[PDB]
């Protein structure tokens, strides 16, 4: 019935408050938070129709080459059934 989404960041960059704040105030979002660059968006309930999420991540450390970070999505009840999906940076 319920679910949670994790997002590990590449090298070292975080987002701003008017983009993190704007996520909790939308359909299916319980809490938006970041635990040591793991940008977790706490989803409310699971649904068949597609739901899109978005925000701006500001580049701090410009020492870059080619590393795509991970995305996780496991339900709040049974954490064994999830789906991985690595995303690459816009420059890499
Ligand atoms: C989701 O999909 C199933 C069929 O795949 C459907 O029976 C159901 O009504 C849909 N919605 C919910 C809330 O389960």
What does the alpha-carbon distance between residue 63 and residue 65 come to, in Å, rounded to a whole number?
7
CA of 32 to the centre of ligand 1 (A): 27
Rounded to the nearest whole angstrom, what is the distance from the C-alpha of residue 47 to the centroid of ligand 1?
A: 8
* Closest to 88 measured CA to CA, from 71, 72, 68: 68
Identify the residue whose tokens are 């597609």.
Answer: 50
- For residue 31, the cross-strand partners are 42
Q: How far is the CA of 1 from the centre of ligand 1 (A)?
A: 12
Q: How was this entry determined?
A: X-ray
Residue with tokens 């701090």: 60
Ligand 1 center–CA 48 separation, angstroms: 7
Q: Are strands 13-15 and 57-59 parallel, antiparallel or unpaired?
A: antiparallel
Tell me how far the alpha carbon of residue 49 lies from the centroid of ligand 1, in angstroms.
9
Burial (0-12, 13-18, 19+ Cβ within 10 Å), 18: exposed
d(CA 30, CA 23) in angstroms, rounded, equals 9
- Ligand 1 mean position to 50 CA, how many Å? 13
Q: Compute, in angstroms, the gap from residue 75 CA to the centroid of ligand 1.
A: 17
Q: Residue 68 in contact with residue 92, Cβ under 8 Å?
A: yes
Residues contacting 21, CB < 8 A, separation 6+: 32
| Residues contacting 83, CB < 8 A, separation 6+ | 73
* Spatial distance between the Cα atoms of 18 and 48, rounded to a whole number of angstroms: 29
């Amino acid at each position: 019935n319920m679910a949670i989404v994790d997002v590990k960041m590449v090298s070292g960059f975080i987002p701003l408050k008017p983009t993190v704040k704007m996520l909790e105030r939308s359909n299916h979002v319980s809490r938006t938070e970041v635990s040591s660059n793991h940008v977790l968006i706490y989803l409310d309930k699971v649904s068949n129709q597609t739901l899109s999420l978005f925000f701006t991540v500001l580049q701090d450390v410009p020492v870059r080459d080619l590393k795509p970070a991970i995305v996780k999505v496991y339900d709040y009840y049974e954490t064994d059934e999830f789906a991985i999906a690595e995303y690459n940076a816009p420059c890499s």
